[PDB]
Amino acid sequence: ADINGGGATLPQKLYQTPDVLTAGFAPYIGVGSGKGKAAFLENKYNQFGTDTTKNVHWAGSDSKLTATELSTYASDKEPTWGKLIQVPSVATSVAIPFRKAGTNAVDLSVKELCGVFSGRITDWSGITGSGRSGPIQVVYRSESSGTTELFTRFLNAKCTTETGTFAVTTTFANSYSGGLTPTAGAVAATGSQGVMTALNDTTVAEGRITYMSPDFAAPTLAGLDDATKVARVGKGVANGVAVEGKSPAAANVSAAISVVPVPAAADRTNPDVWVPVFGATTGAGVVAYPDSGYPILGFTNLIFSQCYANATQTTQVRDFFTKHYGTSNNNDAAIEANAFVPLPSNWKAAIRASFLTASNALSIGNTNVCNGKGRPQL
C-alpha cells in the first residue's frame, strides 16, 4: 500500500525531512538520478531495495528525461499506466566545497573553476587571492548523477578557453574531451554523501575540491557563506570594474529563478518543456545563465504518473502535490532550511492548474483520462 520513491541524492535530505512527503509516502531512498529514472521508467524496485513485492511510484531526479526515455515510456507504458509527469521540485545552486586551510576567502573566477575541473590547475597557488599553495585534487561522482548533469551543463556553457571542451553528461569522467588528466589526480566516490566523506577525510593530504548539493556542501546554512570551506564563484570584471564572486546560498540564485518563464501554455502536454535548463544563450527551453548572483544553478525534479490504479494512492499523490505546490501550509520553510529555492508563485500555479485541477486533461487521477489506467499498487 505504501507509495515508493527514490533517486537523486542532491535533494534526499529534503524528502527525508518529516512531513515534506505527506501521508502514504514510504521513506525516500537516495541512489542517484540515473538509478531513480530507471526505477520509475522500468518499474524496477531493485534499484531501491530487495523487496520483490513492491512497485515504484515516483522518482526524484536532477537529470532530465532524455528523448529516448520519454519515447520508450510513451510506447511501452503510457497506454496502460497513463502519461508520465515531469516537473521541477525546487531550484538549487551547485556548491564548490573544498578542504584546504587558510583564512583568505577562496573566490573562483569562472576561468579558474574551468581550469580546476579540466585538470589544468593543479596547485592552490593558481587561484588568485587564495592565500594557499599545494596540490588541488578534484573529487567527482562515479555514477550517473543529476548533480553532474547540472554542473557539466554550466561547464559546457562557460568553459570556452581550455584546450578541450566539456560535454553535458551524468557521468563526469566522460565530460572533458581530453579525458581525465593523469597528473591532475582526480578521484571518484559514490553519492553526494560518499563524495563529502572523501572531501572531509582527514587521514589524507589537504587539497580536495568538488561540486555538490548545497544541502550537503556544509553542515549548516551559515557554512555555505564560509569562503574558507565553500568557494565563492564569479570573481571577474564587469564593464571594466572588478567584481567579487558570490556564495552558493539560496538567496544568491532566487532572483534568477524568479524570471524563468513558465512553459508555453500550448506545449504543456510535453514533459520535456516543464523543466527549463540553463545555457550560454536564451533559446527554446533554455534560459541564459545569469550575469548576476551566484552563477551555477538549475532545477531538481519530480517524476510521477498521471494515473494510479489504486484509489488511496491516487488521493495521496494529489495531496502531496497540493502541499508541495501550495500557496499556504506548504513545504517552503523546509525547502529553505535545506538550502534550496522554492518555486516562484507563477510556477507553482502552472503546476497546480495542469496537474491538480480536475477539469484539466493532464490532471492526476482525471476520471476520463485515467479511466481503466494507472501504475500498479503492489
Coordinates of C-alpha atoms in Angstrom, one line a residue:
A1 CA 0.0 0.0 0.0
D2 CA 2.9 2.5 0.6
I3 CA 3.9 4.9 -2.2
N4 CA 7.6 4.2 -3.1
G5 CA 10.1 6.7 -4.4
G6 CA 13.7 7.4 -4.6
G7 CA 16.6 8.6 -6.9
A8 CA 18.5 11.8 -6.7
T9 CA 20.7 12.2 -3.7
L10 CA 21.0 16.0 -4.1
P11 CA 17.6 16.6 -2.5
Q12 CA 17.4 13.5 -0.4
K13 CA 17.7 15.3 3.0
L14 CA 14.7 17.5 1.9
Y15 CA 12.5 14.4 1.1
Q16 CA 13.6 12.8 4.3
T17 CA 12.6 15.8 6.4
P18 CA 9.5 14.9 8.4
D19 CA 6.2 15.9 6.8
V20 CA 7.7 17.1 3.5
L21 CA 6.3 13.9 1.9
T22 CA 2.7 13.6 3.1
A23 CA 0.7 10.5 4.2
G24 CA 1.2 7.2 2.4
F25 CA 4.7 8.0 1.2
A26 CA 7.4 5.5 2.2
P27 CA 10.8 6.9 3.2
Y28 CA 12.7 8.3 0.2
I29 CA 15.6 6.1 -1.0
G30 CA 18.7 8.0 -2.3
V31 CA 20.5 6.1 -5.0
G32 CA 21.4 8.7 -7.7
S33 CA 19.3 10.2 -10.5
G34 CA 20.3 7.6 -13.1
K35 CA 19.0 4.7 -10.9
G36 CA 15.9 6.7 -10.0
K37 CA 14.9 7.3 -13.6
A38 CA 15.4 3.6 -14.4
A39 CA 13.4 2.6 -11.3
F40 CA 10.4 4.6 -12.4
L41 CA 10.6 4.1 -16.2
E42 CA 11.0 0.3 -16.0
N43 CA 9.1 -0.2 -12.6
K44 CA 12.2 -1.8 -11.1
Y45 CA 12.2 -1.6 -7.3
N46 CA 15.5 -3.4 -7.3
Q47 CA 17.2 -0.1 -7.9
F48 CA 15.9 0.9 -4.5
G49 CA 15.8 -2.3 -2.5
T50 CA 15.4 -6.1 -2.4
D51 CA 11.7 -6.5 -1.8
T52 CA 10.1 -8.4 -4.6
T53 CA 6.5 -7.4 -3.9
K54 CA 7.0 -3.6 -4.2
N55 CA 6.3 -1.3 -7.2
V56 CA 7.9 2.1 -7.9
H57 CA 5.5 5.0 -7.9
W58 CA 7.7 8.1 -8.3
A59 CA 11.3 9.3 -8.6
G60 CA 13.5 12.3 -7.7
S61 CA 15.9 13.3 -10.5
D62 CA 18.2 16.3 -11.3
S63 CA 18.9 14.6 -14.7
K64 CA 16.2 15.4 -17.3
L65 CA 14.4 12.6 -19.0
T66 CA 16.0 12.0 -22.4
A67 CA 14.1 11.8 -25.7
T68 CA 14.7 8.0 -25.8
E69 CA 13.5 7.6 -22.2
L70 CA 10.3 9.5 -23.0
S71 CA 9.6 7.8 -26.2
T72 CA 10.1 4.3 -24.8
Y73 CA 7.8 5.1 -21.9
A74 CA 5.2 6.5 -24.3
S75 CA 5.2 3.4 -26.4
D76 CA 5.6 0.7 -23.7
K77 CA 4.0 2.0 -20.5
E78 CA 1.7 5.0 -21.2
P79 CA -1.1 3.0 -22.9
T80 CA -1.9 1.2 -19.7
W81 CA -0.2 3.4 -17.0
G82 CA -1.0 6.8 -18.3
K83 CA 1.2 9.8 -19.2
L84 CA 4.3 10.5 -17.1
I85 CA 4.6 13.8 -15.4
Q86 CA 8.0 15.6 -15.0
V87 CA 8.0 18.9 -13.1
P88 CA 10.5 20.9 -11.1
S89 CA 10.5 20.3 -7.4
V90 CA 12.8 23.1 -6.2
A91 CA 15.7 25.2 -7.6
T92 CA 19.3 24.8 -6.4
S93 CA 22.8 26.2 -6.7
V94 CA 25.7 23.8 -7.3
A95 CA 28.2 24.5 -4.5
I96 CA 32.0 24.1 -4.6
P97 CA 33.2 22.8 -1.2
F98 CA 36.9 22.2 -0.6
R99 CA 39.3 21.1 2.1
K100 CA 42.3 23.5 2.3
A101 CA 43.1 25.5 5.4
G102 CA 43.6 29.3 5.2
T103 CA 41.9 32.4 6.4
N104 CA 41.5 34.0 3.0
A105 CA 38.3 33.8 1.1
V106 CA 38.5 31.4 -1.9
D107 CA 36.7 33.2 -4.7
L108 CA 36.9 31.4 -8.1
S109 CA 36.7 33.2 -11.4
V110 CA 34.8 31.1 -13.9
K111 CA 38.1 30.7 -15.8
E112 CA 39.7 29.3 -12.6
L113 CA 36.8 26.9 -12.0
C114 CA 37.1 25.7 -15.5
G115 CA 40.9 25.2 -15.0
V116 CA 40.5 23.2 -11.8
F117 CA 37.9 20.9 -13.3
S118 CA 39.7 20.4 -16.6
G119 CA 42.9 19.4 -14.7
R120 CA 44.9 22.4 -15.9
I121 CA 45.1 24.0 -12.4
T122 CA 46.7 21.5 -10.0
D123 CA 48.0 23.9 -7.3
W124 CA 46.2 26.3 -5.0
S125 CA 48.8 28.9 -6.0
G126 CA 47.0 29.1 -9.3
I127 CA 43.9 30.7 -7.8
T128 CA 44.3 34.5 -7.2
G129 CA 43.8 35.6 -3.7
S130 CA 43.7 32.1 -2.4
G131 CA 46.4 32.6 0.3
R132 CA 47.1 28.9 -0.3
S133 CA 49.6 26.7 -2.0
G134 CA 49.9 22.9 -2.6
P135 CA 48.1 20.3 -4.6
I136 CA 44.4 20.5 -5.6
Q137 CA 42.6 17.2 -6.1
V138 CA 39.2 17.0 -7.7
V139 CA 36.6 14.5 -6.3
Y140 CA 33.8 13.6 -8.8
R141 CA 30.8 11.3 -8.8
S142 CA 31.4 7.7 -10.1
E143 CA 27.8 7.0 -11.1
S144 CA 25.1 8.6 -13.2
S145 CA 24.4 11.8 -11.4
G146 CA 22.0 14.7 -11.8
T147 CA 24.4 16.9 -9.8
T148 CA 27.0 16.1 -12.6
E149 CA 24.4 17.0 -15.2
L150 CA 23.6 20.4 -13.7
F151 CA 27.4 21.1 -13.2
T152 CA 28.6 20.0 -16.6
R153 CA 25.8 21.9 -18.3
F154 CA 27.5 25.0 -16.8
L155 CA 31.0 24.0 -17.8
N156 CA 29.7 23.3 -21.3
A157 CA 28.3 26.8 -21.5
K158 CA 31.1 28.8 -20.0
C159 CA 34.5 26.9 -20.3
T160 CA 35.4 28.1 -23.7
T161 CA 39.2 28.8 -23.4
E162 CA 40.5 25.4 -22.2
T163 CA 42.4 23.0 -24.5
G164 CA 39.3 20.8 -24.6
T165 CA 35.6 21.2 -24.0
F166 CA 33.1 19.7 -21.5
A167 CA 30.1 17.8 -22.8
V168 CA 26.8 17.8 -20.8
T169 CA 26.6 14.4 -19.1
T170 CA 25.6 12.5 -16.0
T171 CA 29.0 10.7 -15.9
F172 CA 31.7 13.2 -15.0
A173 CA 34.6 11.0 -16.2
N174 CA 33.1 11.2 -19.8
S175 CA 32.7 15.0 -19.8
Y176 CA 36.0 16.6 -20.8
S177 CA 37.2 15.9 -24.3
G178 CA 40.8 15.4 -23.2
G179 CA 39.8 12.7 -20.7
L180 CA 40.9 12.8 -17.1
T181 CA 44.3 14.4 -16.9
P182 CA 46.6 11.8 -15.2
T183 CA 48.8 14.3 -13.5
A184 CA 45.8 16.1 -12.0
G185 CA 45.0 13.1 -9.8
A186 CA 41.2 13.4 -9.8
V187 CA 39.4 10.7 -7.8
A188 CA 35.9 9.2 -7.7
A189 CA 33.3 8.4 -5.0
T190 CA 29.7 7.4 -4.9
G191 CA 26.7 9.5 -3.9
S192 CA 26.5 13.1 -2.5
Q193 CA 27.4 11.6 0.9
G194 CA 30.3 9.4 -0.5
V195 CA 31.9 12.4 -2.1
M196 CA 31.5 14.6 1.0
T197 CA 33.1 11.7 3.1
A198 CA 36.1 11.8 0.6
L199 CA 36.3 15.6 0.7
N200 CA 36.3 15.6 4.5
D201 CA 38.7 12.7 5.0
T202 CA 41.3 14.0 7.5
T203 CA 43.6 10.9 7.0
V204 CA 44.8 12.1 3.6
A205 CA 46.5 15.2 2.4
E206 CA 44.6 18.5 2.2
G207 CA 43.6 20.0 -1.1
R208 CA 40.4 18.2 -2.3
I209 CA 37.6 20.1 -4.1
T210 CA 34.3 19.0 -5.6
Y211 CA 30.8 20.1 -6.9
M212 CA 27.9 19.4 -4.5
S213 CA 24.3 19.8 -3.5
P214 CA 24.2 22.9 -1.2
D215 CA 22.3 20.8 1.4
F216 CA 25.4 18.5 1.7
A217 CA 28.2 21.0 1.0
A218 CA 28.2 22.5 4.5
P219 CA 26.9 21.2 7.8
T220 CA 24.7 24.3 8.3
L221 CA 23.4 27.0 6.1
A222 CA 25.8 29.5 7.5
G223 CA 28.6 27.3 6.4
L224 CA 27.8 28.0 2.8
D225 CA 28.9 31.5 3.4
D226 CA 32.3 30.5 4.9
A227 CA 34.6 31.0 1.9
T228 CA 37.4 29.2 3.7
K229 CA 35.4 26.0 3.2
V230 CA 32.9 26.7 0.3
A231 CA 34.2 28.7 -2.6
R232 CA 32.6 31.9 -3.8
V233 CA 32.2 31.9 -7.7
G234 CA 32.1 34.8 -10.1
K235 CA 35.2 36.9 -9.4
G236 CA 36.0 38.9 -12.5
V237 CA 35.5 42.1 -14.4
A238 CA 32.1 43.6 -15.4
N239 CA 32.1 46.7 -17.6
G240 CA 35.7 47.5 -16.7
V241 CA 35.0 47.1 -13.0
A242 CA 36.4 44.4 -10.7
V243 CA 33.6 42.3 -9.2
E244 CA 33.6 39.7 -6.4
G245 CA 32.0 36.3 -6.5
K246 CA 29.0 35.1 -4.5
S247 CA 28.3 32.2 -2.1
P248 CA 26.0 29.4 -3.3
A249 CA 23.4 30.4 -0.6
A250 CA 19.9 30.1 -2.0
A251 CA 19.3 33.9 -1.7
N252 CA 22.0 34.3 -4.4
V253 CA 20.1 32.3 -7.0
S254 CA 16.5 33.1 -6.2
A255 CA 16.3 36.3 -8.3
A256 CA 17.5 34.5 -11.4
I257 CA 15.0 31.7 -10.8
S258 CA 12.2 34.2 -10.4
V259 CA 12.3 35.2 -14.0
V260 CA 12.4 31.8 -15.6
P261 CA 9.4 31.7 -17.9
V262 CA 6.7 29.1 -17.4
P263 CA 6.2 26.6 -20.1
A264 CA 4.2 27.9 -23.1
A265 CA 0.6 27.2 -22.4
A266 CA 0.2 25.2 -25.7
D267 CA 3.2 22.9 -25.1
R268 CA 2.3 21.6 -21.6
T269 CA 1.5 18.0 -22.8
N270 CA 5.2 17.5 -23.4
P271 CA 7.0 16.6 -20.1
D272 CA 10.3 17.9 -21.6
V273 CA 9.2 21.6 -21.6
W274 CA 8.3 21.5 -17.9
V275 CA 12.0 21.5 -16.8
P276 CA 13.9 24.5 -18.1
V277 CA 17.7 24.2 -18.5
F278 CA 20.3 26.9 -18.5
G279 CA 22.8 27.7 -21.2
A280 CA 25.1 30.3 -22.7
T281 CA 22.3 32.0 -24.5
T282 CA 18.5 32.2 -24.5
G283 CA 16.7 29.6 -26.6
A284 CA 13.7 27.2 -26.8
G285 CA 13.5 25.6 -23.3
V286 CA 16.9 27.3 -22.5
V287 CA 17.5 30.2 -20.2
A288 CA 20.8 32.2 -20.3
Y289 CA 23.0 31.6 -17.2
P290 CA 22.7 34.8 -15.1
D291 CA 25.3 37.5 -15.1
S292 CA 24.3 38.5 -11.5
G293 CA 24.0 36.5 -8.3
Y294 CA 25.7 33.0 -8.0
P295 CA 26.3 31.6 -11.5
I296 CA 25.8 27.9 -11.2
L297 CA 22.1 26.9 -10.8
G298 CA 19.3 24.7 -12.0
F299 CA 16.3 22.6 -11.1
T300 CA 15.8 19.3 -9.4
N301 CA 12.7 17.5 -10.4
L302 CA 9.8 15.0 -9.7
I303 CA 8.8 12.2 -12.0
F304 CA 5.2 10.8 -11.3
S305 CA 2.4 9.1 -13.2
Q306 CA -0.8 10.9 -14.1
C307 CA -2.7 7.7 -13.2
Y308 CA -2.5 5.2 -10.4
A309 CA -4.6 2.0 -10.3
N310 CA -5.2 2.4 -6.5
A311 CA -7.8 4.8 -5.2
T312 CA -5.9 5.7 -2.0
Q313 CA -2.6 6.2 -3.8
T314 CA -4.3 8.5 -6.3
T315 CA -5.6 10.6 -3.5
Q316 CA -2.3 10.6 -1.6
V317 CA -0.3 11.6 -4.6
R318 CA -2.7 14.5 -5.2
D319 CA -2.4 15.5 -1.5
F320 CA 1.5 15.7 -1.9
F321 CA 1.2 18.0 -5.0
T322 CA -1.3 20.1 -3.1
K323 CA 1.2 20.7 -0.3
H324 CA 4.4 20.9 -2.2
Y325 CA 3.0 23.4 -4.8
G326 CA 0.6 25.1 -2.4
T327 CA 0.1 28.8 -1.7
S328 CA -0.2 28.1 2.1
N329 CA 0.7 25.4 4.6
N330 CA 3.3 24.3 2.2
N331 CA 6.9 22.9 2.1
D332 CA 8.6 26.3 1.5
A333 CA 10.1 26.6 5.0
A334 CA 11.6 23.1 4.8
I335 CA 12.8 23.8 1.3
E336 CA 14.7 26.9 2.5
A337 CA 16.0 25.0 5.6
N338 CA 17.5 22.5 3.1
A339 CA 19.5 25.2 1.2
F340 CA 17.1 25.2 -1.8
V341 CA 14.9 27.8 -3.5
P342 CA 11.1 27.5 -3.5
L343 CA 9.5 27.7 -6.9
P344 CA 8.0 31.1 -7.8
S345 CA 4.3 31.5 -7.3
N346 CA 3.6 31.6 -11.1
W347 CA 5.4 28.3 -11.5
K348 CA 3.5 26.7 -8.6
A349 CA 0.2 27.9 -10.1
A350 CA 1.0 26.5 -13.5
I351 CA 1.8 23.1 -12.0
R352 CA -1.4 23.1 -9.9
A353 CA -3.6 24.2 -12.8
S354 CA -2.3 21.4 -15.1
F355 CA -1.7 18.5 -12.7
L356 CA -4.3 19.1 -9.9
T357 CA -7.3 21.0 -11.3
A358 CA -9.7 18.1 -12.2
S359 CA -11.1 19.6 -15.4
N360 CA -7.6 19.8 -17.0
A361 CA -6.9 16.8 -19.2
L362 CA -3.4 16.5 -17.6
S363 CA -4.6 16.2 -14.1
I364 CA -3.6 13.4 -11.7
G365 CA -6.5 10.9 -11.4
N366 CA -8.6 12.6 -14.1
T367 CA -11.6 10.4 -14.3
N368 CA -11.9 10.4 -18.1
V369 CA -8.2 10.2 -19.0
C370 CA -7.3 7.7 -16.2
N371 CA -10.4 5.5 -16.8
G372 CA -9.0 1.9 -16.6
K373 CA -5.4 3.0 -16.5
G374 CA -2.6 3.5 -13.9
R375 CA 0.6 2.3 -12.3
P376 CA 0.2 -0.8 -10.2
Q377 CA -0.1 -0.7 -6.3
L378 CA 1.8 -3.7 -5.2

